[PDB]
Amino acid sequence: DHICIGYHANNSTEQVDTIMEKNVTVTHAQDILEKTHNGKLCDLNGVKPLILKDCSVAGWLLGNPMCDEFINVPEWSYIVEKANPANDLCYPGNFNDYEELKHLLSRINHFEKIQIIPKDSWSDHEASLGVSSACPYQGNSSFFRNVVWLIKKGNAYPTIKKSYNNTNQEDLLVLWGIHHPNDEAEQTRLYQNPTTYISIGTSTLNQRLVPKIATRSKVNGQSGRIDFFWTILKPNDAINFESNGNFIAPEYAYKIVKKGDSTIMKSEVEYGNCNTRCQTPMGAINSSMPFHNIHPLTIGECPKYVKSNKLVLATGLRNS
Amino acid sequence: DHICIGYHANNSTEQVDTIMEKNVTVTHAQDILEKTHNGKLCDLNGVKPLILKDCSVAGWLLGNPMCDEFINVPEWSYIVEKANPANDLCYPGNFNDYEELKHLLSRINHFEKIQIIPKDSWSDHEASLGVSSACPYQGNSSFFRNVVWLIKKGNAYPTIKKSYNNTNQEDLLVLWGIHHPNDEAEQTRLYQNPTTYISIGTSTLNQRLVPKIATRSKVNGQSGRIDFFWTILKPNDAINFESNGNFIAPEYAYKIVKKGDSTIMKSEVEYGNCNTRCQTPMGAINSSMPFHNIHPLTIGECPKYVKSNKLVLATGLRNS
Amino acid sequence: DHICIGYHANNSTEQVDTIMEKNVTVTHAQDILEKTHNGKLCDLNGVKPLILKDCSVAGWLLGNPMCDEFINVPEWSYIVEKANPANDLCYPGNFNDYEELKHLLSRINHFEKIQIIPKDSWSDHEASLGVSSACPYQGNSSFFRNVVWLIKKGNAYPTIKKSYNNTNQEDLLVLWGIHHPNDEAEQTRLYQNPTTYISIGTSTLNQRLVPKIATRSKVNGQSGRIDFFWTILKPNDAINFESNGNFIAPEYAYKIVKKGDSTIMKSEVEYGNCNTRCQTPMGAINSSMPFHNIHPLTIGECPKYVKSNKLVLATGLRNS
Amino acid sequence: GLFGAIAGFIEGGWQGMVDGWYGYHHSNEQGSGYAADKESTQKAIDGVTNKVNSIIDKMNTQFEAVGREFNNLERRIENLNKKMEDGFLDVWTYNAELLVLMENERTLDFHDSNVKNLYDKVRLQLRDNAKELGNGCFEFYHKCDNECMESVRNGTYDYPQYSEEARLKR
């Protein structure tokens, strides 16, 4: 009469690793690493991203004319921008504190584009002359739509005094610019006054900008440059502009009406009319696993990222 | 005749965790995590902190008149400052490289406040006119005490040339300012000369400052602004100031006479006439434990910080 | 008849540590920690380093006259510079964005020193007068060799217009300077024109520099200062300079012809005519071990760095 | 193994045993076949299940990358940013792999320990009342019904009972 003590076994081929032994075949294993993605960009819990296509963030916020698609943007779950967008600044120049702005952006889900200085309020100055071949719209010359390139009116440029008070409850993103001509002739031909400035003040901002008249390379066919500058105008604060030339005035600004979880994704991956709880620059993830290896930069509720190629937990015993 | 092999047991309820099993009751345990604090701010090994109360570091070093309590400060073990001190700059403006200064501060235990330019040495300029309602002292108008707001003397502002050589063995913190008026009338009414500057030189410093005359929001009832600037004047170096207006001159500077372990604590927790070897923004720690969970930012000899809620070491065996 | 079960033993004294027991003598151990170095600086795989000796990186790239040894430098595997090189700037001043430059440097193995503005091309200006006692060469006065200190020619300083187009396939490092005099007399004595500027433009650079005439400490016997500025001139871009005084013009620039693994080592350790695969500021390492403890900052193929004093792996069993 | 039993004194596993993890095999006139243990398998299920949750949970406070941009005059801080994010990515990749390597070894030795523990709850109740082949099998100095085996399973093997024909079998 014969009784034995023994253990389970099966026809399984799933392998684990240990410190002493690799590929120890086991009875029961649990893979805990997500290795795959749907290869599309998707809605994040029902909210569509903003796909900037061929436009950069600057091109968007200044309103480069090739970016008309983005004149009015709905609320987004996250932002997607190419590595090298073709439409940025039609007119060459610098965008001051650009990265700090994108950082701000990344904590923002929606803007309302509001008008802060009316294009009809410039009686003593020309407000539509005012365009460049560097920024074309359908063959004809144009300019960034959110700002107004003021020009002299009949051989004179009186001192602009303009202010705007923030009567809203939300912060405002205000943008403006300075034109740097190539020589002093174009300086007089544009603004009459040879020596000029732009002062900009708020309760925390105190800036004076002076044009830099100099000879540079043509970029986009221009040797002149335009530098853009921004601030966050708080509720009940006012912004005051004073200039006697070279002023690229605001027309519109952006009201910050929704804040929360966002990011600016770098990707070329097509939007694919899907919906996900976790998104990566390479594609979306639908998994119950706690680890993945697709990309470090994700948004949503995601598995934790690792660089591993395989990651399996032995649950059963050594197979035979 | 009967001999047995067995183990200790007791009426204990102390529990530990392990990878497979949680709350395994044990015979002997050692809690290694400090979870409590005395809830007061204390002396650190016999040296009292500097409790800035309602003043900020800037308010202190410039000598905002509401901060008279700090005209002379004894050596401190650490500094405590509120989240939003009410007395900072009575007169609105910028404090240049403020955070870099606080960083310097944090490695400093004591200053000697010395006089570097005598308030009696301005014969060709008015040195007491010189005050604003923005910085009141007992109803009447005043100014930051460490600096002197120079004004024109009888419709003239000759060029200031002033220098000071550091005859001490310690480094010096030197502070000075520039006034930015609202319009060119106040500019002439204050300093006579319409176009002005402040040059400041040392063996490493070479600065020119120009006033920015512009229209801004009233802050503290003022639209003018004052920007403050500092340097570390080395032993045997000299500092040279040249100005033809808008100069907020030094009167006093701070000699760095004690360096070592300090920090700038953010806290609202009352000082409590006690003494400790380890201090946290929430309160002091008196423990022999090697870990605590009170706050990451401490000073003194402290347990190492963790985010754990419980941390107990099993020393004995499983209980029954 | 007697058969036994037992284990190996030996006369060994090599000890290991474990969690419960320290210095457990063992039968077989493997030390995995490299603790020693040859104490010389060496070639890195056949390529000699650049030993700057008594010169700093700035002194080199501007061509301080005491650094003639480095007028032409072969390709290097890494750079070695002292803690406090005696030859930096013969003439006192600032080197703008110095650290960002060294960072660039550190990814560079070789420059070609090319001529971008010919010293013979200044017909309307004096190009050899032009020197200071601050920068002596063999008793007589001299200047940084890579740049040209322009002076007025016969009581006049016409407006310089000079440009240079990058006809090469490699990026260029371009350097230039501005002179800040002590008083307005020396300003007129040097450059005739009292109010001056330097504009510098590229496709991304747009700079205006204004001299700061002020009183400072003598440093190297001078109270005047010279600030140096640089850019990376891309292939097919041009650089344009315009100035009516105080211009310290480029003569030569550096072509970036080899990029790859380099570093800037701080060390006083003599070069020792050896060759290594792994180099540290303290000396070279020749080892098969996977860990060392010599210094964190190494170059080459190296063991991973730890702070441990001993690190031994038990391979055998407990000795007797 | 480490406890000598799996891939040791008990050479292989029983395909016919799919009733559980660690079981018995009874072989008497009435019938052959297998039967698993419950207070042995289940206890191993909890321990392995709890361990898995523990590993995962211990891992959810791990570092999460964030994108930050920089201009061409911020090369030092951008490089600092890159090295500090890879730095943490490498730490957590190290931690997860290493906690998997180490628990795998323990999970395997846990099983082995639980089989050897089983072989010893039966043996230390059978005394000199049975044969020990040493292959993970037991032969009797007496007769055993199908529900007699159930006594040695349940843990309630009656010693002041079968001693007579055991001692006299010698």
Next chain:
Amino acid sequence: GLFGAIAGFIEGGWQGMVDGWYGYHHSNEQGSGYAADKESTQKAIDGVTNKVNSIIDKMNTQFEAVGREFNNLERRIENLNKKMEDGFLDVWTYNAELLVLMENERTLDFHDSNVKNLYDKVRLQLRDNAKELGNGCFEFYHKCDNECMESVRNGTYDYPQYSEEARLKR
């Protein structure tokens, strides 16, 4: 346990044993009661004490937060600062918890291993000169004085002595 002895072949613990950690119990005409082991308990005291110091000491090179301030145009580097300090706080919180979880398991199995080791220093000296109940108790094929037990404690149990009445008890 993992070594089958604690909460295994030795069901529970002895409240009356507060003399030490791992002990014996003698029960002869002269007197009942408990007595602990010293070369067994003490050796466990060192090992557990050393382990504790090791854990703590291994932990004093851990990351220490530092406060740094930033202006409103330093948002990227302030965020970098925040993530790198929490980053290290999380690493060290992970390390300390995990080293506590893992050593707890080992400390428990160390004890278990030391009890089972004890049961086998007595058994492998008693041979066929005594009964093995299998509950962590031993009955004799001979008579044992109070200072006879002290022979099996001390380790010096005399075999070329008691063999006569043991063999003849059968």
Next chain:
Amino acid sequence: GLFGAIAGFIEGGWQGMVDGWYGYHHSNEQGSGYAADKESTQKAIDGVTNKVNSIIDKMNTQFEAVGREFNNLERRIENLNKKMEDGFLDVWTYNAELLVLMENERTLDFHDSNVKNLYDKVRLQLRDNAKELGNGCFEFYHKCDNECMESVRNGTYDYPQYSEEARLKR
């Protein structure tokens, strides 16, 4: 040890054994001396060798310092740089030391486990056909040739053979 055998029931090590790690000693009329085991030593060689490579390999994704310079108005970020590099240096110094401390303990207990496993592959084949001294030695109830020991080494000890003079020796 942890498995009771090294520095336990087998007091010391055999200097005369330099044939391998875990061996036997035969002592019959023909000749004394030692002989090691191969399927026991070698299996321990692989396991220890693989472990070493594993530790090292697991360690080559470790943090590598980089020098970055800063001006006197970059004191906050330079300090940030210093703390983040020491931060990682401390983490990896912690990891390497701790993985060495922990594997050392395991390597030692692995050996111990493999000796005790050996003592039990012989014992569980010898049954009642031999004496068990309990010191890591075995005496016979029968006669054994030099190539008879080789049967208990090879694993092929013939039981349906020597049973006659073993049973009758009592």
